[PDB]
């Protein structure tokens, strides 16, 4: 009877909330029917990938609670996500451990 | 003994790229923010989260500059970075 | 009020069923979701204004996603976008 | 059988090695893939370090373990 529409699409992001934020965002006059469905699936996928990589980073650093350093290490270590979020600062993010090869004195 | 010069600097790079904390002292940074904003509008107030946002933004900006300046100095066959290198780095960057 | 935090946490339990995130990580993921939401909606809006239409639909969002997301992120996002639209239209 | 190691640049190294080999041989194996000789290759495997006369069979070797070049030329 209730039958939430995000469950009709088989998702976990709020399709009704996405549809509302489309309608009052002044993006267009009308808003199509499948538009918040498509966008909710896309948002859910992007969160799914970044949380999967952050879970791998937290498990590799032996801590079971993802801190924002793990998000920094998840994002800046692959090409597509670092190309997407390339102008994005993360609070308590830190930097990848990069050292230029010339500054390594031999012998 | 005494460490050879450069080894402690490499250890410092290994430390401060592993850490994530704020490398500038918070109270003199706050007083700097308040006296910069003193000139635009007198007698403002600040949310502490806003001053922390300014803290992290300006530190991340300077880290970006120092990485680009390090690239410019390695390009100039040197190891010391120089104000020459800073000025070139941000001129190419667009500033 | 109002966040995506519940939904991010559900996706987190669905992917890594053992871990957790601190509140700063949840805030960063929330800001992430808001940012990509307004990016994709801002691109689909101006696609509709270019083509002189007045309804933002799934085609508009598909081309905006294909513009914004680089590499294989577009090729996957398009795929489950159409999967979710078809599964929604069947019910 | 296929073991990885991060460099000070930040770069991972891919290499396959028999899990009963020595440590001087795998310093030679990484010297094959990088531009760094093992006069300055100091390795760490989970806290306890590496010595060239020792073998992988005693140092907890598995599928896809990790090594780490570090620092400190005395």
């Amino acid at each position: 009877k209730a039958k939430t529409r995000s469950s009709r699409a088989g998702l976990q992001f709020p399709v009704g909330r996405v549809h509302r934020l489309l309608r009052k965002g002044n993006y267009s006059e009308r808003v199509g029917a499948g538009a918040p469905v498509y966008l909710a699936a896309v948002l859910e996928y992007l969160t799914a990938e970044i949380l999967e990589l952050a879970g791998n980073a937290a498990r590799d650093n032996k801590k079971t609670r993802i801190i924002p350093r793990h998000l920094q290490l998840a994002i800046r270590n692959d090409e597509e996500l670092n190309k997407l979020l390339g102008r994005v600062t993360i609070a308590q993010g830190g930097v990848l451990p990069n050292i230029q090869a010339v500054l390594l004195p031999k012998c | 003994h005494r460490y050879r010069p450069g080894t402690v600097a490499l250890r410092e790079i290994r430390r401060y790229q592993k850490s994530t904390e704020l490398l500038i002292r918070k109270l003199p940074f706050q007083r700097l923010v308040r006296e910069i904003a003193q000139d635009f509008k007198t007698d403002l107030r600040f949310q502490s989260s806003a001053v922390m946002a300014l803290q992290e933004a300006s530190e991340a900006y300077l880290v970006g500059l120092f990485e680009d300046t390090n690239l410019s100095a390695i390009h100039a066959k040197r190891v010391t970075i120089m104000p020459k290198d800073i000025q070139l780095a941000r001129r190419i960057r667009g500033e | 009020k109002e966040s995506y935090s519940v939904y991010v946490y559900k996706v987190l339990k669905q992917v890594h069923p053992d871990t957790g995130i601190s509140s700063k990580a949840m805030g960063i993921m929330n800001s992430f979701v808001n940012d990509i939401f307004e990016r994709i909606a801002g691109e689909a809006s101006r696609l509709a204004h270019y083509n002189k239409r007045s309804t933002i639909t799934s085609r508009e969002i598909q081309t905006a996603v294909r513009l914004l997301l680089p590499g294989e992120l577009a090729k996957h996002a398009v795929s489950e976008g159409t999967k979710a639209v078809t599964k929604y239209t069947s019910a | 059988m296929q073991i990885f190691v991060k460099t000070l640049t930040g770069k991972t190294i891919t290499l396959e090695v028999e899990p009963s080999d020595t440590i001087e041989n795998v310093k030679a194996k990484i010297q094959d893939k990088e531009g760094i000789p093992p006069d300055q290759q100091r390795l760490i495997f989970a806290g306890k370090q590496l010595e060239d006369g020792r073998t992988l069979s005693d140092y907890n070797i598995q599928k896809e373990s990790t090594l780490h070049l570090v620092l400190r030329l005395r």
Binding site: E52, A57, N61, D78 | - | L73 | -
Partner: peptide, 23 residues
């Protein structure tokens, strides 16, 4: 799990380790 035929992750394995490496 469900999200293992739906992502992109193929190559390579990525290291996420950070070691305080003393002497």
């Amino acid at each position: 799990h469900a999200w293992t035929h739906r992502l992109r992750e193929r190559k390579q394995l990525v290291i996420y380790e950070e070691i305080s490496d003393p002497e």
